[PDB]
């Protein structure tokens, strides 16, 4: 549980490193094994942090790295949309495995719960005020939403991934720097595929900037690799 302070002197103009392979991809491993090498690869390289999803992943990466992870639970509550820690007993199970951020879907969009939003973030907070939570939204004001019902770290994974939000190919650097300026503690992330637009992100003033698939998804950079011969 480190302060939001000690955690923001971690991050600062580091680059965190998420480490995932849901079911079908072709670095899931039922056994697992698998993503704490890309972790450990990371934490070689001097990654700041890591994230990751599932209670296996996560407990797997505890055990050979000691940089605070941003944790999730995927998991589907038909029919409504949102999966990232979609429900309390998401965000329970995350409590308990005492890391540094849970990250949790915060868009617009209706819950199963059928909460609103803003009511949710002040109940987990409530329940447990020790804990840092990261807002993953699509959006400036869902951004905002968040901000306001007290989450401690916005950031811009879902952007691309709702109807109404960016579509546009590319980091959404726009919403990005607009939440920056807002003044909001913006951890980056989403889309970002070169150290070039890292660097230009990084200089924005975020807290921390999150790369994915470009570095832990081989699939998805050799994909690009041969689309460019095309």
């Known amino acids: 549980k480190p302060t939001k302070e000690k955690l923001m002197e971690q991050l600062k103009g580091g680059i965190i490193v998420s480490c995932q392979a849901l079911p079908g991809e072709p670095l899931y491993s039922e056994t697992g094994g698998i993503m704490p090498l890309m972790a450990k690869a990371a934490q070689e390289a001097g990654a700041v942090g890591i994230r990751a999803n599932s209670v296996r992943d996560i407990k797997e990466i505890q055990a050979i790295t000691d940089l605070p992870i941003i944790g999730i639970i995927k998991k589907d509550y038909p029919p409504q949309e ?116 890292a660097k230009k992100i990084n200089d924005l003033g975020v807290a921390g900037i999150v790369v994915g698939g470009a570095i832990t998804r081989p699939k998805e950079i050799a994909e690009r690799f041969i689309e460019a011969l095309k």
């Open 82 to 197: 949102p999966f990232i820690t979609a429900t309390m007993t998401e965000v329970d199970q995350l409590a308990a495995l005492n890391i540094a951020v849970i990250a949790m879907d915060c868009t617009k969009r209706d819950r199963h719960d059928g909460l609103d939003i803003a009511s949710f973030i002040r109940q987990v907070k409530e329940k447990y005020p020790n804990q840092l939570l990261m807002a993953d939204i699509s959006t400036f004001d869902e951004g905002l939403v968040a901000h306001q019902a007290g989450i401690d770290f916005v950031g811009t994974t879902l952007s691309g991934y709702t109807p109404y939000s960016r579509q546009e190919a590319g980091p959404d650097v726009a919403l990005i720097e607009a939440l920056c300026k807002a003044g909001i503690a913006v951890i980056a992330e989403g889309k970002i595929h070169s150290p070039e637009e």
